[PDB]
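Input set for joint prediction.
Command: fold jointly, output tokens.
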Amino acid sequence: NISPWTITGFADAESSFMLTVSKDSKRNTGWSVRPRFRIGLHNKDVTILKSIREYLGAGIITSDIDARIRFESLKELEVVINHFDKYPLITQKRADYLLFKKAFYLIKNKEHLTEEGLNQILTLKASLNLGLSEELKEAFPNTIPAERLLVTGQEIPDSNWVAGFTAGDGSFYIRIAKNSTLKTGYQVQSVFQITQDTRDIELMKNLISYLNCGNIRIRKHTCVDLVVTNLNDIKEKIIPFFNKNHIIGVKLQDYRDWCKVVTLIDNKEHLTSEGLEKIQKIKEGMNRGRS
DNA sequence: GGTCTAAACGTCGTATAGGAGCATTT
DNA sequence: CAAATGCTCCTATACGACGTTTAGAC
Ligand SMILES: [Ca+2]
Ligand SMILES: [Ca+2]
Ligand SMILES: [Ca+2]
Ligand SMILES: [Ca+2]
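tokens >
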């Protein structure tokens, strides 16, 4: 059974809080307003959604071109709010969450069915994710966006948060570099990685302190990566950590193979031709190459 | 100076995030 | 008949993941 912090960590990675405001002649305000919480994944990781569903006792799961769990009814959203209030997000999504939560409150008390309250919802939507479309701006032209919590000073709340977070955005891959200065002609490196928009670089920096290893990389996305390449950071920090705090989803299979390769590297078989072929074959069966 | 590790640097493709609204039930 | 919510379809970017070169440790 999945840990609650794993869910929050995973949601920090993969979830979305949304407000849809659509024109509807049949409603008294002329508008339909609704809050949503959703996670969407590749079909192959539907099992993650089911584990989440069994835990919260709520949510509607669908599978078509992708896999989704959604919370749209007030009862379902209440479950969502109770959880994240209890196990709070620590990425910038907390600010999206807080906007979302205010809208939810407005709707529960039926203030969205009035014009003033309707107007209030849009200021929240205006500051939520991608904000108001031009069209929504036109219909509600003088909307001033609600205050957004700038999220700062967040401590890693729990080891299972990291596991959930890494299961969404994290990566375990084996890096092979063509390099004539090596006998085999290639360097082999086991790599652990977390990718995130630079808006949360502080958090990534916090994750490095928390795991006591890794470097910060700013690319040429505008995304930042946490990267661990040090062999005995991997051996003595990363692998023991994720052994206790389990990766979920297909990536768990990737982790295990990744773990296996670290052993091979640790025994220097990568510095031999035969071992390198071994490693390549495993690598070819990991991540995107996994069928 | 020869191997090797660490990590700085490079970069593509899509699974994520985020979105909007009609249909059906209450 | 209006409010809730079940259901479905659209967009694209923040991711994941793969490759090379450089600093330097030994
Ligand atoms: Ca993410
Ligand atoms: Ca993911
Ligand atoms: Ca992700
Ligand atoms: Ca992708």
